[PDB]
Design a protein around this ligand. Structure first.
Ligand code: BB2
Ligand code: ZN
Ligand code: ZN
Ligand code: ZN
Ligand code: ZN
Ligand code: ZN
Ligand code: ZN
Ligand code: ZN
Ligand code: ZN
Length: 203
């Protein structure tokens, strides 16, 4: 099955493992994982995080032909499970100094969900792109500004976490994938750049 291919020890996830727009798995509601995790589900989560790290690394991205990403959901690898990985980098300063924390968020999350959110909405000013979508899609992807999430880690431990900013946006995006929702679903149908008053536009 797809999972067996992906969890082979020597296998590195690349773009040929990522399904594309139009594949039905992208529109399913992903199934909840049960704890204790199987070996395969644990391995998949590790390989997903590995892909993001690769994707972000100039060398490996180039070796393996990867488009850079900051999150990945199991449904995008044809696996209908509630497993996402997020890897959101902090940026260097103007003098070239690395940030204090390499990442503002770095997590493999099992059964994640949004449990509360702000009334305020937000969108990234540059829009959103997707590894499964090979088309230009303009417009503001309107999300919750702030979210509280719950999720499990690979050991079964429950986390509850409030997010904001870019971190908020990224997790929302991944969560949507495990519910069958695509980013463009949240772009206004008649003017992609419409702004309802109070929308937090993020730079
Ligand atoms: C920001 C919402 C989360 C994006 C996650 C996606 C990758 C994906 O398809 N996840 O399921 C990505 O990294 N996309 C990038 C993306 O949209 N980025 C990366 C930097 C900020 C933002 C565009 O403004 C690229 C591929 C376009
Ligand atoms: Zn592969
Ligand atoms: Zn392990
Ligand atoms: Zn590596
Ligand atoms: Zn609500
Ligand atoms: Zn996506
Ligand atoms: Zn919501
Ligand atoms: Zn709760
Ligand atoms: Zn539309």
């Amino acid at each position: 099955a797809a999972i067996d291919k992906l969890v082979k020890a020597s296998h590195l996830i690349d773009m040929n493992d990522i399904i594309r727009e139009g594949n039905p798995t992208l529109r399913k509601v992903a199934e909840e994982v049960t704890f204790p995790l199987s070996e395969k589900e644990e391995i998949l989560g590790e390989k997903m995080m590995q892909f993001l790290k690769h994707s972000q690394d100039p060398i490996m991205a180039e070796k393996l032909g990867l488009r850079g990403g900051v999150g990945l959901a199991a449904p995008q690898l044809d696996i209908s499970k509630r497993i996402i990985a997020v890897l959101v980098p902090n940026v260097e300063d103007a003098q070239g100094n690395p940030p204090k924390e390499a990442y503002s968020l770095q997590e493999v999350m099992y059964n994640p969900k949004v449990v509360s959110h702000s009334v305020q909405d937000a969108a990234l000013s540059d829009g959103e792109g997707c590894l499964s979508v090979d088309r230009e899609v303009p417009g503001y992807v309107v999300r919750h500004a702030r979210v509280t999430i719950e999720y499990f880690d690979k050991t079964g431990e429950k986390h509850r976490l409030k997010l904001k900013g870019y971190n908020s946006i990224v997790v929302q995006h991944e969560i949507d994938h495990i519910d069958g929702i695509m980013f463009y679903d949240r772009i206004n149908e008649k003017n992609p750049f419409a702004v309802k008053e109070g929308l937090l536009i993020l730079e």
